[PDB]
C-alpha cells in the first residue's frame, strides 16, 4: 500500500504545479473510499495555517488545486464501517481456533501478520505497533520480521517522521546476522540518507542513498522516479565534477531514465552545464529545475533556496580557479545575470569562511587563491578548543 503513503504526504509539500497536486489529491479521494482509515486522512487536514497553496478552503482564500476538498467528514463512514469492524472480528475469530488447538508455528504468527498489515488499512495507532509485536515474539527469524519492519517503515509517510521510524527499528535492523543480504541493502540505505538530509551531511548518503544497488525501486519505501531524482540532486553537491562522468553516467540506472522519462529535466541541464562549465546556460536552469524537482521534492522542499544559492556560485567558483585575471563586466554580461545581485550573494558568504578567493567590484580585477595554506592548517586546533574541554570539566566535579 505505497500509493496511500505517498499521496497522503506529497500533497502538503507542493505549492506549485496544480497538475502535480491533482495527482496528490484526486488519487486520495478515490482510494480513501476503498480503505478504512478515518484518522490518518484527517491528520493530513490538521496542518493548514501557515502554508502556501493548500488544497482546502477554510481560513484562507487560495485552494489552487483542481481538487478543492481534502476535508474529513462523516460521509466516509458509509463505506468505512462495512469493512472496518467486520473483518477485524472475523480474523480475530480464527485466532480463537489457533491457540486452543495449537496448529503450527506459522498460523499463530501469520494471523497477526494478516492483522498488523490490515491494521494499517484500518488506520489504528497502537494496533499497528503493539499488537503487531505479538507475531514478532512468536517468530524469532529475521525473515518474518520484514513485515514488522515494513509496517514501521511505511510510517515515515504516515506519521511524517524522519527520526522515530528508524529509532524503533534500530534494534530490529541490527540484531546479529547481517551478511550479504540484498533486500536489507535497499531498506537500510534508503532511510539512512533521509535522516542526514536535515543535518545536511550528505557525505554518508553519497555511497548509500545516492548509490542504489537496485535499478528499480523498493515499492513501499520510495518510488522509481524518486530514487533516481535524489541521486542527481545530491550527487552534484557531494561528488565532484570528475566523479560525475565516472559514476552518475557510468551507472546503468541513468541510461534507462534518459530514454524514458525526460520530465526531470536535470539530466540535460544540470549535468551538461556543469560538465561544460558554462555559467550562462546554468543560470536559467536553476528555477526550471527548482520548480519541477525541488518544489515537488518530499524531503528537501523545506530548505531549498539556501541550498540552491550555495551550489549556484560553486559552479562559478570552480571556474574561477581556471582563470587568473578576469574583469567584472567581460563575460558576466553575457551570462544573463546582474552585477548588483551577484555581489550581494557573494558578500554574505564571507563570514561563512567560504571565500578565500579574489573578488572585486568597483575595479573588477578577479583572481583566484590557494585555500590550502598554514592558516586553515592551524584552524583544526582552534575549532577543538571549546569542544574538547566540554566533557573534561563536566564530569570531573564529583568524580575525580
Amino acid at each position: 500500500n505505497y500509493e496511500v503513503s505517498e499521496k497522503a504526504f506529497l500533497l502538503t509539500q507542493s505549492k506549485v504545479s496544480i497538475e502535480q497536486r491533482k495527482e496528490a489529491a484526486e488519487f486520495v479521494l478515490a482510494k480513501i473510499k476503498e480503505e478504512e482509515m478515518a484518522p490518518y486522512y484527517k491528520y493530513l487536514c490538521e496542518e493548514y495555517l501557515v502554508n502556501n497553496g493548500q488544497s482546502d478552503l477554510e481560513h484562507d482564500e487560495k485552494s489552487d488545486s483542481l481538487n478543492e476538498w481534502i476535508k474529513f467528514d462523516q460521509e466516509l463512514y458509509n463505506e468505512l464501517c462495512k469493512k472496518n469492524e467486520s473483518k477485524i472480528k472475523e480474523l480475530n475469530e480464527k485466532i480463537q481456533k489457533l491457540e486452543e488447538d495449537d496448529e503450527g508455528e506459522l498460523e499463530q504468527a501469520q494471523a497477526w501478520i494478516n492483522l498488523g498489515e490490515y491494521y494499517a488499512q484500518i488506520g489504528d495507532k497502537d494496533n499497528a505497533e503493539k499488537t503487531l509485536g505479538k507475531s514478532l515474539s512468536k517468530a524469532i527469524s529475521t525473515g518474518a520480521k520484514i513485515d514488522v519492519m515494513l509496517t514501521i517503515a511505511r510510517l515515515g509517510f504516515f506519521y511524517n517522521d524522519q527520526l522515530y521510524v528508524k529509532e524503533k527499528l534500530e534494534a530490529v535492523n541490527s540484531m546479529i546476522e547481517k551478511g550479504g543480504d540484498w533486500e536489507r541493502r535497499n531498506r537500510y540505505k534508503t532511510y539512512y540518507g533521509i535522516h542526514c538530509l536535515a543535518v545536511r551531511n550528505f557525505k554518508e548518503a553519497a555511497k548509500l542513498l545516492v548509490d542504489s544497488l537496485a535499478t528499480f525501486t523498493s515499492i513501499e519505501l520510495t518510488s522509481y522516479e524518486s530514487i533516481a531524482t535524489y541521486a542527481s540532486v545530491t550527487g552534484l553537491f557531494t561528488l565532484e565534477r570528475t566523479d560525475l562522468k565516472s559514476k552518475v553516467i557510468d551507472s546503468p540506472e541513468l541510461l534507462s531514465l534518459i530514454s524514458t522519462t525526460a520530465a526531470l529535466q536535470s539530466i540535460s541541464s544540470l549535468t551538461i552545464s556543469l560538465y561544460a562549465s558554462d555559467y550562462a546556460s546554468y543560470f536559467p536552469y536553476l528555477l526550471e529545475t527548482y520548480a519541477n524537482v525541488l518544489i515537488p521534492c518530499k524531503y528537501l522542499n523545506r530548505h531549498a533556496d539556501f541550498f540552491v544559492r550555495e551550489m549556484r556560485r560553486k559552479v562559478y567558483a570552480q571556474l574561477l580557479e581556471s582563470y587568473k585575471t578576469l574583469s567584472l563586466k567581460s563575460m558576466a554580461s553575457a551570462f544573463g545575470v546582474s552585477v548588483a545581485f551577484l555581489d550581494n550573494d557573494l558578500g554574505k558568504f564571507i563570514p561563512n569562511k567560504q571565500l578565500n578567493c579574489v573578488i572585486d567590484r568597483v575595479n573588477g580585477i578577479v583572481e583566484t587563491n590557494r585555500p590550502d595554506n598554514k592558516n586553515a592548517q592551524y584552524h583544526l586546533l582552534v575549532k577543538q578548543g571549546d569542544g574538547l574541554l566540554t566533557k573534561l570539566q563536566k564530569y570531573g566535579a564529583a568524580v575525580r
Binding site: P284, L286, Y290, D305, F306, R309, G336, V337, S338, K348
Partner: peptide, 27 residues
C-alpha cells in the same frame, strides 16, 4: 542550523526571472 538556514528570503524566484528579462531586452 544557524540563521542562514532559517532565513529563507524567498528572493531567488523573482531575481532569476528579472535578470533573464533584462539581458534579452538589451539586444
Amino acid at each position: 542550523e544557524n540563521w542562514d538556514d532559517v532565513e529563507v528570503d524567498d528572493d531567488f524566484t523573482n531575481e532569476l526571472k528579472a535578470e533573464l528579462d533584462r539581458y534579452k531586452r538589451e539586444n
